[PDB]
Amino acid sequence: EGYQYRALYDYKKEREEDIDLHLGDILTVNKGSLVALGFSDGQEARPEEIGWLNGYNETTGERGDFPGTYVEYIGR
Fold first, then answer.
1. Given 27, 33, 58, 63, which residue has the most CB atoms within 10 angstroms?
2. Can you give the residue ranges of the SH3 domain?
3. DSSP assignments along 17-45, one per residue
C-alpha cells in the first residue's frame, strides 16, 4: 500500500535532492519513505501537512523529494 498525489503547482528543485516537479505531475510516494518518522495512518494523504515527500514523478520518469504543499494525495 503506497501513496500517490498530484502536483497542483509546479516546482523545479531547490534542495540538492528535489526532482523537477510540474503541475499535472504524478508522484508515487511509498508509505514507508514518509512513515520513516512515524506518520499516523492517513497522515500521508495530507501532504500539505507533511513537509517533504519522496515519490516517483512518472510524468518525467524520475524520482526524488518535493514540497508536499505543492501536491495533493488522492489515494494509493
1. 27
2. 1-76
3. TB--B-TT-EEEE-SHHHHTT---TTGGG
